[PDB]
Design a protein around this ligand. Structure first.
Ligand code: CA
Ligand code: CA
Ligand code: CA
Ligand code: CA
Ligand code: CA
Length: 397
Protein backbone atom coordinates (compact mmCIF):
# COMPACT_ATOMS: atom_id res chain seq x y z
CA UNK A 1 0.00 0.00 0.00
CA UNK A 2 1.12 3.56 -0.81
CA UNK A 3 0.20 6.66 1.20
CA UNK A 4 1.33 10.28 1.00
CA UNK A 5 2.36 11.64 4.41
CA UNK A 6 2.79 15.34 5.20
CA UNK A 7 4.88 16.24 8.26
CA UNK A 8 6.01 19.45 9.96
CA UNK A 9 9.69 19.57 10.88
CA UNK A 10 10.71 20.57 14.39
CA UNK A 11 14.09 21.45 15.93
CA UNK A 12 14.82 17.70 16.28
CA UNK A 13 14.18 16.84 12.61
CA UNK A 14 11.33 14.91 11.06
CA UNK A 15 11.45 12.26 13.78
CA UNK A 16 12.56 9.03 12.08
CA UNK A 17 15.73 7.16 11.11
CA UNK A 18 16.57 6.02 7.58
CA UNK A 19 18.66 3.15 6.21
CA UNK A 20 19.62 1.99 2.74
CA UNK A 21 20.99 3.57 -0.40
CA UNK A 22 23.15 2.53 -3.32
CA UNK A 23 26.16 2.22 -0.97
CA UNK A 24 24.25 0.00 1.47
CA UNK A 25 22.07 -2.52 -0.44
CA UNK A 26 23.24 -5.29 1.90
CA UNK A 27 20.63 -4.17 4.46
CA UNK A 28 17.64 -4.04 2.06
CA UNK A 29 18.64 -6.09 -1.06
CA UNK A 30 18.02 -2.98 -3.21
CA UNK A 31 19.00 0.71 -3.35
CA UNK A 32 15.88 2.09 -1.67
CA UNK A 33 15.57 4.29 1.41
CA UNK A 34 13.63 2.74 4.30
CA UNK A 35 12.34 3.92 7.67
CA UNK A 36 14.02 1.91 10.44
CA UNK A 37 12.81 3.64 13.62
CA UNK A 38 10.33 6.37 14.61
CA UNK A 39 11.47 8.64 17.45
CA UNK A 40 8.79 9.29 20.06
CA UNK A 41 7.36 12.83 20.21
CA UNK A 42 8.77 13.48 16.73
CA UNK A 43 6.61 14.71 13.88
CA UNK A 44 6.28 11.24 12.34
CA UNK A 45 5.33 9.77 15.74
CA UNK A 46 2.37 12.06 16.46
CA UNK A 47 1.17 11.79 12.85
CA UNK A 48 0.88 8.01 13.18
CA UNK A 49 0.94 7.13 9.48
CA UNK A 50 4.67 6.46 9.01
CA UNK A 51 5.68 2.92 9.99
CA UNK A 52 9.00 1.19 10.55
CA UNK A 53 9.90 -0.62 7.34
CA UNK A 54 8.24 1.82 4.94
CA UNK A 55 10.01 2.56 1.67
CA UNK A 56 10.41 6.29 1.00
CA UNK A 57 9.41 6.59 -2.67
CA UNK A 58 9.15 10.40 -2.90
CA UNK A 59 10.19 13.45 -0.86
CA UNK A 60 8.65 16.90 -1.45
CA UNK A 61 7.43 15.49 -4.73
CA UNK A 62 10.58 14.04 -6.26
CA UNK A 63 11.07 10.31 -6.75
CA UNK A 64 14.08 9.00 -4.82
CA UNK A 65 16.23 7.14 -7.33
CA UNK A 66 19.79 5.77 -7.06
CA UNK A 67 20.75 7.85 -4.02
CA UNK A 68 23.71 7.27 -1.76
CA UNK A 69 22.86 7.14 1.94
CA UNK A 70 24.31 10.61 2.56
CA UNK A 71 22.46 11.99 -0.47
CA UNK A 72 19.18 10.88 1.11
CA UNK A 73 20.21 12.45 4.43
CA UNK A 74 20.99 15.72 2.63
CA UNK A 75 17.63 15.48 0.85
CA UNK A 76 15.73 15.10 4.13
CA UNK A 77 17.59 18.01 5.77
CA UNK A 78 17.07 20.48 2.89
CA UNK A 79 13.40 19.59 2.36
CA UNK A 80 12.15 22.50 4.47
CA UNK A 81 9.82 22.36 7.45
CA UNK A 82 6.73 21.15 5.54
CA UNK A 83 7.76 17.84 3.94
CA UNK A 84 5.58 15.48 1.91
CA UNK A 85 6.54 11.80 1.80
CA UNK A 86 5.10 9.21 -0.58
CA UNK A 87 5.84 5.95 1.23
CA UNK A 88 5.16 2.22 0.73
CA UNK A 89 3.74 0.34 3.73
CA UNK A 90 9.60 -11.45 0.91
CA UNK A 91 6.89 -9.06 -0.24
CA UNK A 92 8.25 -9.85 -3.72
CA UNK A 93 7.70 -13.56 -3.12
CA UNK A 94 4.21 -12.82 -1.77
CA UNK A 95 3.38 -10.84 -4.91
CA UNK A 96 4.85 -13.47 -7.26
CA UNK A 97 2.92 -16.19 -5.42
CA UNK A 98 -0.37 -14.30 -5.74
CA UNK A 99 0.13 -13.62 -9.46
CA UNK A 100 1.07 -17.25 -10.12
CA UNK A 101 -2.12 -18.30 -8.31
CA UNK A 102 -4.31 -15.97 -10.37
CA UNK A 103 -2.44 -17.20 -13.46
CA UNK A 104 -3.17 -20.84 -12.57
CA UNK A 105 -6.81 -20.01 -11.84
CA UNK A 106 -7.27 -17.85 -14.95
CA UNK A 107 -9.59 -19.41 -17.52
CA UNK A 108 -7.32 -21.42 -19.79
CA UNK A 109 -4.32 -20.91 -17.44
CA UNK A 110 -1.97 -17.95 -17.92
CA UNK A 111 1.11 -19.99 -18.81
CA UNK A 112 2.86 -16.84 -20.07
CA UNK A 113 2.81 -15.12 -16.67
CA UNK A 114 3.97 -18.30 -14.94
CA UNK A 115 6.98 -18.57 -17.26
CA UNK A 116 7.72 -14.84 -17.05
CA UNK A 117 7.93 -15.12 -13.26
CA UNK A 118 9.65 -18.44 -12.62
CA UNK A 119 12.23 -18.37 -15.42
CA UNK A 120 13.25 -14.82 -14.42
CA UNK A 121 13.85 -15.54 -10.73
CA UNK A 122 16.83 -17.10 -9.00
CA UNK A 123 16.59 -20.57 -7.50
CA UNK A 124 16.51 -19.23 -3.93
CA UNK A 125 13.89 -16.70 -5.00
CA UNK A 126 11.82 -19.60 -6.35
CA UNK A 127 12.06 -21.36 -2.98
CA UNK A 128 10.69 -18.23 -1.28
CA UNK A 129 7.88 -18.05 -3.85
CA UNK A 130 7.03 -21.68 -3.10
CA UNK A 131 6.86 -20.96 0.63
CA UNK A 132 4.51 -18.00 0.16
CA UNK A 133 2.33 -19.95 -2.28
CA UNK A 134 1.85 -22.87 0.12
CA UNK A 135 1.06 -20.51 3.00
CA UNK A 136 -1.56 -18.61 0.98
CA UNK A 137 -3.25 -21.53 -0.80
CA UNK A 138 -2.39 -24.45 1.52
CA UNK A 139 -1.31 -26.30 -1.64
CA UNK A 140 2.14 -27.16 -2.98
CA UNK A 141 3.21 -24.96 -5.89
CA UNK A 142 4.84 -27.75 -7.90
CA UNK A 143 1.79 -29.98 -7.46
CA UNK A 144 -0.44 -27.11 -8.58
CA UNK A 145 1.72 -26.41 -11.64
CA UNK A 146 1.92 -30.14 -12.42
CA UNK A 147 -1.85 -30.06 -12.94
CA UNK A 148 -1.82 -26.64 -14.62
CA UNK A 149 1.02 -27.21 -17.11
CA UNK A 150 1.86 -30.01 -19.52
CA UNK A 151 4.44 -31.25 -22.01
CA UNK A 152 8.00 -29.99 -21.98
CA UNK A 153 6.98 -26.74 -20.27
CA UNK A 154 5.87 -28.80 -17.26
CA UNK A 155 9.26 -30.55 -17.21
CA UNK A 156 11.11 -27.20 -17.25
CA UNK A 157 9.00 -25.42 -14.63
CA UNK A 158 8.96 -28.40 -12.28
CA UNK A 159 12.72 -28.74 -12.61
CA UNK A 160 13.17 -25.07 -11.75
CA UNK A 161 11.11 -25.47 -8.56
CA UNK A 162 13.71 -27.88 -7.13
CA UNK A 163 16.91 -26.78 -5.46
CA UNK A 164 20.06 -27.54 -7.48
CA UNK A 165 20.89 -30.56 -5.31
CA UNK A 166 17.28 -31.80 -5.42
CA UNK A 167 17.10 -31.51 -9.20
CA UNK A 168 20.40 -33.34 -9.68
CA UNK A 169 19.38 -36.04 -7.20
CA UNK A 170 16.00 -36.54 -8.88
CA UNK A 171 17.54 -36.76 -12.37
CA UNK A 172 20.07 -39.29 -11.06
CA UNK A 173 17.22 -41.36 -9.59
CA UNK A 174 15.27 -41.11 -12.85
CA UNK A 175 18.31 -42.36 -14.78
CA UNK A 176 18.47 -45.57 -12.72
CA UNK A 177 14.88 -46.44 -11.77
CA UNK A 178 13.52 -49.39 -13.71
CA UNK A 179 15.52 -51.78 -15.85
CA UNK A 180 16.74 -49.38 -18.54
CA UNK A 181 19.61 -47.29 -17.18
CA UNK A 182 19.96 -43.88 -18.84
CA UNK A 183 23.75 -43.96 -18.88
CA UNK A 184 23.97 -40.69 -20.82
CA UNK A 185 22.09 -38.76 -18.13
CA UNK A 186 23.97 -40.53 -15.33
CA UNK A 187 27.33 -39.82 -17.00
CA UNK A 188 26.46 -36.19 -17.74
CA UNK A 189 25.68 -35.40 -14.10
CA UNK A 190 28.42 -37.38 -12.34
CA UNK A 191 31.19 -36.18 -14.68
CA UNK A 192 30.27 -32.48 -14.66
CA UNK A 193 29.57 -31.81 -10.97
CA UNK A 194 32.05 -30.32 -8.52
CA UNK A 195 33.10 -31.77 -5.18
CA UNK A 196 30.83 -29.33 -3.34
CA UNK A 197 27.88 -30.09 -5.63
CA UNK A 198 28.34 -33.86 -5.27
CA UNK A 199 28.69 -33.77 -1.49
CA UNK A 200 25.37 -31.93 -1.29
CA UNK A 201 23.84 -34.28 -3.89
CA UNK A 202 24.86 -37.32 -1.85
CA UNK A 203 23.24 -35.67 1.17
CA UNK A 204 19.99 -34.68 -0.56
CA UNK A 205 19.71 -38.02 -2.38
CA UNK A 206 19.73 -39.91 0.94
CA UNK A 207 17.06 -37.62 2.39
CA UNK A 208 14.82 -37.82 -0.68
CA UNK A 209 15.06 -41.54 -1.45
CA UNK A 210 16.19 -43.11 1.88
CA UNK A 211 19.19 -44.73 0.15
CA UNK A 212 22.78 -43.76 -0.58
CA UNK A 213 23.46 -42.62 -4.13
CA UNK A 214 26.48 -44.94 -4.28
CA UNK A 215 24.31 -48.00 -3.61
CA UNK A 216 21.86 -47.21 -6.41
CA UNK A 217 24.90 -46.79 -8.67
CA UNK A 218 26.29 -50.19 -7.69
CA UNK A 219 22.91 -51.77 -8.45
CA UNK A 220 22.45 -50.25 -11.92
CA UNK A 221 26.07 -50.44 -13.16
CA UNK A 222 28.78 -53.06 -13.56
CA UNK A 223 32.36 -53.47 -14.68
CA UNK A 224 34.93 -50.71 -14.92
CA UNK A 225 32.03 -48.38 -15.75
CA UNK A 226 30.64 -48.99 -12.26
CA UNK A 227 34.07 -48.33 -10.75
CA UNK A 228 34.51 -45.01 -12.56
CA UNK A 229 31.03 -43.81 -11.59
CA UNK A 230 31.35 -44.81 -7.93
CA UNK A 231 34.73 -43.06 -7.79
CA UNK A 232 33.48 -39.81 -9.32
CA UNK A 233 30.30 -39.66 -7.23
CA UNK A 234 32.33 -39.66 -4.01
CA UNK A 235 33.12 -36.00 -4.73
CA UNK A 236 36.47 -36.10 -2.92
CA UNK A 237 38.76 -35.06 -5.76
CA UNK A 238 41.91 -33.27 -4.60
CA UNK A 239 41.17 -29.58 -4.24
CA UNK A 240 43.24 -27.18 -6.34
CA UNK A 241 46.61 -26.96 -4.63
CA UNK A 242 48.60 -23.75 -4.34
CA UNK A 243 51.54 -25.22 -6.30
CA UNK A 244 51.97 -26.66 -9.78
CA UNK A 245 53.53 -30.12 -9.45
CA UNK A 246 55.42 -30.28 -12.75
CA UNK A 247 57.14 -33.56 -11.86
CA UNK A 248 53.76 -35.15 -11.13
CA UNK A 249 52.23 -33.62 -14.26
CA UNK A 250 54.87 -35.38 -16.38
CA UNK A 251 54.72 -38.67 -14.48
CA UNK A 252 50.90 -38.77 -14.61
CA UNK A 253 51.10 -38.17 -18.37
CA UNK A 254 53.58 -41.05 -18.70
CA UNK A 255 51.34 -43.26 -16.55
CA UNK A 256 48.30 -42.56 -18.76
CA UNK A 257 50.37 -43.38 -21.85
CA UNK A 258 51.77 -46.63 -20.44
CA UNK A 259 48.29 -47.64 -19.26
CA UNK A 260 46.70 -47.36 -22.70
CA UNK A 261 48.10 -46.54 -26.13
CA UNK A 262 51.57 -47.92 -25.35
CA UNK A 263 50.34 -51.37 -24.28
CA UNK A 264 47.91 -54.04 -25.42
CA UNK A 265 44.63 -53.70 -23.61
CA UNK A 266 44.23 -51.02 -20.97
CA UNK A 267 45.07 -50.56 -17.30
CA UNK A 268 41.65 -49.05 -16.60
CA UNK A 269 42.23 -48.80 -12.80
CA UNK A 270 45.23 -46.57 -13.50
CA UNK A 271 43.11 -44.28 -15.69
CA UNK A 272 40.35 -44.14 -13.06
CA UNK A 273 42.84 -43.32 -10.30
CA UNK A 274 44.48 -40.41 -12.10
CA UNK A 275 41.37 -38.83 -13.63
CA UNK A 276 39.21 -39.02 -10.48
CA UNK A 277 41.75 -38.14 -7.75
CA UNK A 278 43.94 -35.39 -9.22
CA UNK A 279 42.67 -31.82 -9.20
CA UNK A 280 41.11 -30.39 -12.36
CA UNK A 281 43.82 -27.73 -13.03
CA UNK A 282 46.46 -30.43 -12.57
CA UNK A 283 44.69 -32.76 -14.99
CA UNK A 284 44.38 -30.02 -17.63
CA UNK A 285 48.17 -29.70 -17.65
CA UNK A 286 48.49 -33.50 -17.59
CA UNK A 287 46.39 -33.83 -20.75
CA UNK A 288 48.64 -31.35 -22.56
CA UNK A 289 51.85 -33.05 -21.41
CA UNK A 290 50.25 -36.32 -22.57
CA UNK A 291 50.32 -34.97 -26.14
CA UNK A 292 54.11 -34.81 -25.93
CA UNK A 293 54.27 -38.60 -25.45
CA UNK A 294 51.29 -39.83 -27.46
CA UNK A 295 50.45 -39.36 -31.16
CA UNK A 296 46.77 -39.13 -30.14
CA UNK A 297 45.38 -36.75 -27.53
CA UNK A 298 43.43 -37.94 -24.50
CA UNK A 299 40.03 -38.01 -26.24
CA UNK A 300 41.34 -39.84 -29.31
CA UNK A 301 43.23 -42.22 -27.00
CA UNK A 302 39.96 -42.97 -25.16
CA UNK A 303 38.10 -43.76 -28.40
CA UNK A 304 40.92 -46.10 -29.45
CA UNK A 305 41.26 -47.94 -26.11
CA UNK A 306 37.76 -48.50 -24.65
CA UNK A 307 34.18 -48.87 -25.85
CA UNK A 308 30.59 -48.67 -24.64
CA UNK A 309 29.62 -47.00 -21.39
CA UNK A 310 33.23 -46.83 -20.20
CA UNK A 311 34.28 -44.97 -23.35
CA UNK A 312 31.32 -42.58 -23.08
CA UNK A 313 32.07 -41.84 -19.42
CA UNK A 314 35.76 -41.15 -20.08
CA UNK A 315 34.97 -38.91 -23.06
CA UNK A 316 32.51 -36.86 -20.99
CA UNK A 317 34.96 -36.70 -18.08
CA UNK A 318 37.91 -35.38 -20.08
CA UNK A 319 35.71 -32.75 -21.75
CA UNK A 320 34.50 -31.47 -18.37
CA UNK A 321 38.08 -31.35 -17.07
CA UNK A 322 39.37 -29.55 -20.15
CA UNK A 323 36.47 -27.12 -20.63
CA UNK A 324 33.16 -27.53 -18.80
CA UNK A 325 31.29 -24.66 -20.56
CA UNK A 326 32.36 -25.93 -23.98
CA UNK A 327 31.23 -29.40 -22.89
CA UNK A 328 27.69 -28.17 -22.25
CA UNK A 329 27.73 -26.08 -25.43
CA UNK A 330 28.50 -29.20 -27.46
CA UNK A 331 25.88 -31.28 -25.65
CA UNK A 332 23.39 -28.47 -26.27
CA UNK A 333 24.35 -28.49 -29.94
CA UNK A 334 23.96 -32.27 -30.10
CA UNK A 335 20.49 -32.16 -28.53
CA UNK A 336 19.28 -29.78 -31.24
CA UNK A 337 21.34 -30.22 -34.41
CA UNK A 338 19.41 -32.99 -36.18
CA UNK A 339 15.86 -34.23 -36.56
CA UNK A 340 13.68 -33.23 -33.63
CA UNK A 341 15.12 -32.47 -30.21
CA UNK A 342 16.64 -34.42 -27.33
CA UNK A 343 14.50 -32.33 -25.01
CA UNK A 344 15.48 -34.20 -21.83
CA UNK A 345 19.11 -33.18 -22.39
CA UNK A 346 18.23 -29.66 -23.56
CA UNK A 347 15.99 -29.01 -20.55
CA UNK A 348 18.36 -30.48 -17.97
CA UNK A 349 21.26 -28.30 -19.13
CA UNK A 350 19.21 -25.10 -19.29
CA UNK A 351 17.69 -25.67 -15.84
CA UNK A 352 20.88 -26.79 -14.12
CA UNK A 353 23.36 -24.35 -15.71
CA UNK A 354 21.37 -21.12 -16.24
CA UNK A 355 22.58 -19.78 -12.88
CA UNK A 356 26.08 -21.33 -12.91
CA UNK A 357 27.95 -20.57 -16.15
CA UNK A 358 25.33 -19.85 -18.82
CA UNK A 359 27.35 -16.83 -19.98
CA UNK A 360 30.41 -19.02 -20.57
CA UNK A 361 28.31 -21.66 -22.31
CA UNK A 362 26.82 -19.03 -24.62
CA UNK A 363 30.27 -17.61 -25.35
CA UNK A 364 31.76 -20.99 -26.28
CA UNK A 365 28.64 -21.85 -28.29
CA UNK A 366 28.63 -18.64 -30.34
CA UNK A 367 32.36 -18.85 -31.05
CA UNK A 368 32.19 -22.49 -32.17
CA UNK A 369 28.92 -22.55 -34.15
CA UNK A 370 28.72 -18.97 -35.48
CA UNK A 371 25.15 -18.59 -34.18
CA UNK A 372 23.88 -17.99 -30.66
CA UNK A 373 22.49 -20.69 -28.40
CA UNK A 374 19.42 -18.43 -28.34
CA UNK A 375 19.10 -18.88 -32.11
CA UNK A 376 19.31 -22.68 -31.97
CA UNK A 377 16.74 -22.87 -29.16
CA UNK A 378 14.47 -20.58 -31.19
CA UNK A 379 14.59 -22.92 -34.19
CA UNK A 380 14.22 -26.23 -32.35
CA UNK A 381 11.43 -25.36 -29.89
CA UNK A 382 8.13 -23.49 -29.99
CA UNK A 383 5.51 -21.91 -27.75
CA UNK A 384 5.77 -21.04 -24.08
CA UNK A 385 8.19 -23.96 -23.80
CA UNK A 386 10.51 -22.10 -26.17
CA UNK A 387 10.00 -18.87 -24.20
CA UNK A 388 10.96 -20.67 -20.98
CA UNK A 389 14.23 -21.93 -22.47
CA UNK A 390 15.07 -18.56 -24.03
CA UNK A 391 14.65 -16.91 -20.62
CA UNK A 392 16.96 -19.45 -18.96
CA UNK A 393 19.39 -18.71 -21.79
CA UNK A 394 19.29 -15.06 -20.71
CA UNK A 395 19.70 -13.29 -24.04
CA UNK A 396 20.86 -13.41 -27.63
CA UNK A 397 24.51 -14.12 -28.49
CA1 CA B 1 -3.85 -20.80 -22.11
CA1 CA C 1 0.49 -31.85 -16.45
CA1 CA D 1 17.88 -49.44 -14.46
CA1 CA E 1 46.10 -50.24 -25.61
CA1 CA F 1 16.70 -30.32 -34.13
Amino acid sequence: TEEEINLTRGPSGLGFNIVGGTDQQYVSNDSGIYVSRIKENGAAALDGRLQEGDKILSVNGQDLKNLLHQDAVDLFRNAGYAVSLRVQHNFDAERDALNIETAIKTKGVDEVTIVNILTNRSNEQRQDIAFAYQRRTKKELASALKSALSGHLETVILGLLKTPAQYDASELKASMKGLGTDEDSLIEIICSRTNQELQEINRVYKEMYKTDLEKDIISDTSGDFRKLMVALAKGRRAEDGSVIDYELIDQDARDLYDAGVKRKGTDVPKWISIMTERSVPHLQKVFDRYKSYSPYDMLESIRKEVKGDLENAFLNLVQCIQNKPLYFADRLYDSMKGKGTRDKVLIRIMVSRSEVDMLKIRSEFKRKYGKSLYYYIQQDTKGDYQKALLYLCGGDD
